[PDB]
RNA sequence: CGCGGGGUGGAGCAGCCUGGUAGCUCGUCGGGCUCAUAACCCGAAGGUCGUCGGUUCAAAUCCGGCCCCCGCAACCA
RNA sequence: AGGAGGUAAAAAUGUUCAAA
RNA sequence: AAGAACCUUACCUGGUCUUGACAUCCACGGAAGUUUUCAGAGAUGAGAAUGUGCCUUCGGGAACCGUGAGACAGGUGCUGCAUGGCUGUCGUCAGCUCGUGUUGUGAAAUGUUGGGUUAAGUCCCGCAACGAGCGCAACCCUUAUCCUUUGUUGCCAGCGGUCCGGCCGGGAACUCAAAGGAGACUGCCAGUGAUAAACUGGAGGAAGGUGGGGAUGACGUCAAGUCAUCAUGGCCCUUACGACCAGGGCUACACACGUGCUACAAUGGCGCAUACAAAGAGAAGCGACCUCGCGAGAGCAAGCGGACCUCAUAAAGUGCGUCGUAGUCCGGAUUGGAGUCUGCAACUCGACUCCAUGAAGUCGGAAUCGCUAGUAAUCGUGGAUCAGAAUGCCACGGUGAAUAC
């Protein structure tokens, strides 16, 4: 934060196919710690995205995923009192780490029923990219170049 | 809501209203025991029960029978 | 603008000893407003302890006419606040006769009630107090009568 | 606190060895589903006779010392401001600041 | 405000417990205030004694007594007959077998308590503060002690508003545990009102 | 006396001219920011429509008398 | 080292006397 | 305030006390004490009985009780701006001084500044400064690995019997237990840097850089807080502001705020089955089992003052099923009735159980708080206090993140 360097902690694959990446997007899902529920359903959800598409499970997901992934944000400037929104890339491991955080986001609304489905669904959309979760992005973007005069 | 071994009550007051029964409706008891339960004998009876700075009269009517004195005799005054 | 000192004596206890009985949540009437007079007779009402509702008076007869039971006899040892009628012959700043003798009267005036014109032309102010020696209640009394305009000056039930 | 309310303590201790403990039986095996006849009740009346006092219930648990009547620490018998005080001197046995 | 009393912080580390019994919870408070007994009463006993510490101890149904302290003479009493009369009188306090033993504590300079009382009552003769307090400090420190810092606190002199003087000399290490103070507090009882006093004392590092 | 205007939340003003449903601004009340008040921000209560009577299904509003205030006129005399 | 360029809108107030 | 029904209790109301509720002193009388009755709210008032005892001032008793008088007694009565004691706090921030010398007439500066470096006036270098002290760190407790010693009430691998319970022989390896110890030091290597301190990366390692936690809080600031822990100068009352008793009030309720618990549900409730803890407490106390009860509990009642027995089968979880987004099986408030226990006493004013009831609330305006690791969040356990009485506090472990550009 102010001089202290960071130690990006290790985060342990997922035990049905060790991606370590969806690990830790169990980890966002994942609420007041009942981790074994969190996977519960970012299983059964994925097996219903595998079932559905037609694609496997993790194959399909960054697929969905990808489609949601912002390139660019918005962040505030200012030069003694003059604040104002800039865009700048963004980094890659904070991108999918985004990308994730609004997929679980869009997923907390659309009251189909069970998590499970709602955020099958959710990535469902993402495939072919019109869901919810890529309204974030779309608008990130607009958030970008229609600010894009800052660098 | 409790003490199911025998309702409770007192001796002084007790005693007082038998006395009381027994030589008919005689003036007013001036007891102090508002943790005294009632019981059927006092019935028409007219114990007073103190409650901070009075006696506040009571007339034992049929209903109250189970209820305690103060229960009877308001404390707090408000507005 | 000068409108429980009275009351706040018998809020401090003493007073009514019904039956020999001291400290009782006894409380004076108002359609008999009774003072040390005619003695009094007590009267147990559910909430309110006992209402000293004067002795002889007709709600108190009605409720003789109810629960005899709860009627009670009534005494007081070692009298507040009453309401004298007191009719005039119309005013028209006439009001200043009875604004007059106040001074030398020490009992403070609660209520200051009045009537009139409604029928025959005359007034009919009434008046709140608070007494103190009964003796002092007669010495006041044929003041009032006194004036001219002051037909009616009795104290009134 | 107050001479008189240390005073007060020690006479509700004495009552209560004096009646209670010993005379408790009344309010024991008679007050017990056995003699259901009007010597159950009798019993729960003898009870009001004896003295407000004396019931166990009563005795406040002062400070040894002092006589504050707040944060006795049952085991020193002693007000968490005076238990403290003793213990930074070190006149309690083996007791120190803890810390883990 | 602040400062761990620091014989506290040092007691299991370095400096043992003025009392060392056993007891569980039953017979425990008890023989804690029966302690605080015979700590006040002996006290007012033995306040000419120049009294350092007093140790209470419980080997069995036993409670002995060692009094620290300097002028072994007006302590024992001629004849050692005056501890007997402590005896008698402290086993009545404690309904048993009271152990009082005596060992003089050789230099009252050193020893906090004994520093304290001199100050104390030196304010209780009217002396002038800020000299008894000097004489303590180049006594104690000549003496020997490695460091040392008295403190006096309250209306002192007679000042009609209360403030805190001090002094110090040589180390005094107050945080590093391993090292050893002796710090006591006394208080006197001037006409004026109570006047506290603190002192602390390190002696050895170990 | 004559002609016209007005009287509406605590205050100043719309709404009346074309009847049913009275709004804005400050002020007031509660919360927020602040070390604390102001400002600022969030939420809120308030007006028998001068008084009396009438027409109407309904009157703040259409009609009249009355009380008050302002404006105009009060000339040849 | 020699240098020029860009670079920070608004934000009031605090009753009087008083510690060796 | 670690725990107001009486008590506590300081406040009110009324009934009462006066050398007193409590202490030292002296005179006189009476052992102390214990039993039961009447009045009264009780205090106490009247008693009616009964008992007369361990050294002899052997005309005593030491005692304890009663009475008398004067000193006193007593105050939770004001003053924390008269105080001690003690505590919050800026702030675990890294600062704060002094001796001497020196510069300045002097208030003062220098040291402590400066280049680097650190979590740190930490350390190194330079410097008219040389040193020292309070601090910083270290020393301390806990946890993280291993070794040694000991083997019950703990443990079970190795063999045996096994009524499969470590249950019994028996085993000391192990988990563990509690002491005595090992280990971490920028010690090793690379590089950056002035061959300085140190810093960056790697190695070995349980542990890597102050490993994580805690305890420890400088000179002082606030004339902060407390005279109600206590102690104390003052001043104040002293047939009373002191003392006892009953009931009462501290729990009042148009309203405002702070701090928390329980929700608004589907990462869920509910029904059934089933998995893995730690840390504690305990005797006028924890209290199995067994029995009746829907239960709260009640009867009987072992073991236990404790690695034994009890509190006390953990819950989140997992398996299965149902409900299927409704104010809905969400929510549990509120309310009626019937009950339990503690306790003289449950009305004011207790906790808990059953049946019944079943509201607001459908993620909260402006604004605002906590939190960087096994933390937050979520989950249940226990303890102090305490007769009973927590969603508070104190402590325990389970599950277990996000992000630090």
Redesign the interface.
């Known amino acids: 934060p102010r001089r202290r360097v960071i130690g990006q902690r290790k985060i342990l694959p997922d035990p049905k196919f060790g991606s370590e990446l969806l690990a830790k997007f169990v980890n966002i899902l994942m609420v007041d710690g009942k981790k074994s529920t969190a996977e519960s359903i970012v299983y059964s959800a994925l097996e219903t995205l595998a079932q559905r598409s037609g694609k496997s499970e993790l194959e399909a997901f960054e697929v969905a995923l990808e489609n949601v992934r912002p390139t660019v944000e918005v962040k505030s400037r200012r030069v003694g009192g003059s604040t104002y929104q800039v865009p700048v890339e963004v980094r890659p491991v904070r991108r999918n780490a985004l990308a994730m955080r609004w997929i679980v986001e869009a997923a907390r609304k659309r009251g189909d029923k069970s998590m499970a489905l709602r955020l099958a669904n959710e990535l469902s959309d993402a495939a072919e990219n019109k869901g919810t979760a890529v309204k974030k992005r779309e608008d990130v973007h607009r958030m970008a170049e229609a600010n894009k005069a800052f660098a | 809501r409790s003490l199911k071994k025998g309702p409770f009550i007192d001796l002084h007051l007790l005693k007082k209203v038998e006395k009381a029964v027994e030589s008919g409706d005689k003036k007013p008891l001036r007891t102090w025991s508002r943790r005294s339960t009632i019981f059927p004998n006092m019935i028409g009876l007219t114990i007073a029960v103190h409650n901070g700075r009075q006696h506040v009269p009571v007339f034992v009517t049929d209903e109250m029978v189970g209820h305690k004195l103060g229960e009877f005799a308001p404390t707090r005054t408000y507005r | 603008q000068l409108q429980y000192t009275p009351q706040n004596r018998s809020?401090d206890?003493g007073r009514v000893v019904?039956?020999?009985?001291?400290?009782?949540?006894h409380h004076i009437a108002r359609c008999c407003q009774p003072i040390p007079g005619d003695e009094i007779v007590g009267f147990?009402t559910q909430?309110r302890?006992?209402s000293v509702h004067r002795a002889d008076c007709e709600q108190l007869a009605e409720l003789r006419s109810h629960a005899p039971?709860?009627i009670?006899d009534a005494v007081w040892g070692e009298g507040y606040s009453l309401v004298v009628r007191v009719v005039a012959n119309d005013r028209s700043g006439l009001l200043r006769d009875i604004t007059t003798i106040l001074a030398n009267e020490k009992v403070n005036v609660l209520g200051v009630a009045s009537r009139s014109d409604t029928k025959q032309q005359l007034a009919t102010i009434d008046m709140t107090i608070e007494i103190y020696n009964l003796q002092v209640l007669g010495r006041v009394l044929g003041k009032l009568n006194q004036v001219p305009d002051v037909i009616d000056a009795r104290r009134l039930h | 606190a107050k001479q008189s309310m240390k005073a007060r303590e020690v006479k509700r201790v004495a009552l209560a060895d004096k009646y209670f403990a010993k005379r408790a039986e009344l309010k024991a095996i008679i007050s017990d589903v056995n003699a259901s006849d009007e010597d159950r009740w009798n019993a729960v009346l003898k009870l009001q006779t004896l003295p407000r006092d004396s019931s166990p219930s009563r005795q406040r648990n002062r400070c040894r010392q002092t006589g504050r009547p707040h944060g006795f620490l049952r085991k020193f018998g002693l007000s968490r401001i005076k238990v403290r005080e003793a213990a930074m001197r070190g006149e309690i046995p083996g007791l120190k600041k803890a810390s883990w | 405000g602040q400062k761990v009393h620091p014989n506290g912080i040092r007691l299991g580390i370095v400096k043992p417990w003025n009392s060392t019994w056993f007891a569980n919870t039953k017979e425990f408070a008890d023989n804690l205030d029966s302690d605080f007994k015979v700590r006040q009463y002996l006290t007012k006993e033995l306040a000419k004694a120049s009294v350092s510490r007093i140790v209470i101890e419980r080997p069995a149904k036993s409670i002995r007594v060692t009094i620290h302290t300097a002028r072994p003479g007006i302590v024992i009493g001629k004849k050692g007959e005056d501890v007997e009369k402590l005896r008698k009188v402290v086993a009545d306090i404690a309904g048993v077998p009271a152990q009082i033993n005596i060992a003089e504590v050789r230099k009252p300079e050193l020893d906090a308590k004994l520093v304290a009382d001199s100050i104390t009552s030196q304010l209780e003769r009217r002396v002038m503060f800020r000299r008894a307090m000097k004489r303590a400090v180049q006594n104690a420190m000549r003496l020997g002690a490695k460091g040392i810092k008295v403190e006096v606190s309250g209306r002192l002199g007679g000042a009609e508003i209360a403030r805190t003087e001090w002094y110090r000399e040589g180390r005094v290490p107050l945080h590093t545990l391993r090292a050893d103070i002796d710090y006591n507090t006394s208080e006197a009882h001037t006409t004026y009102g109570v006047i506290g006093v603190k002192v602390w004392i390190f002696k050895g590092e170990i």
Do not use: P
């Open positions: 809020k206890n019904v039956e020999g009985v001291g400290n009782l949540m147990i909430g302890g006992i039971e709860r009670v």
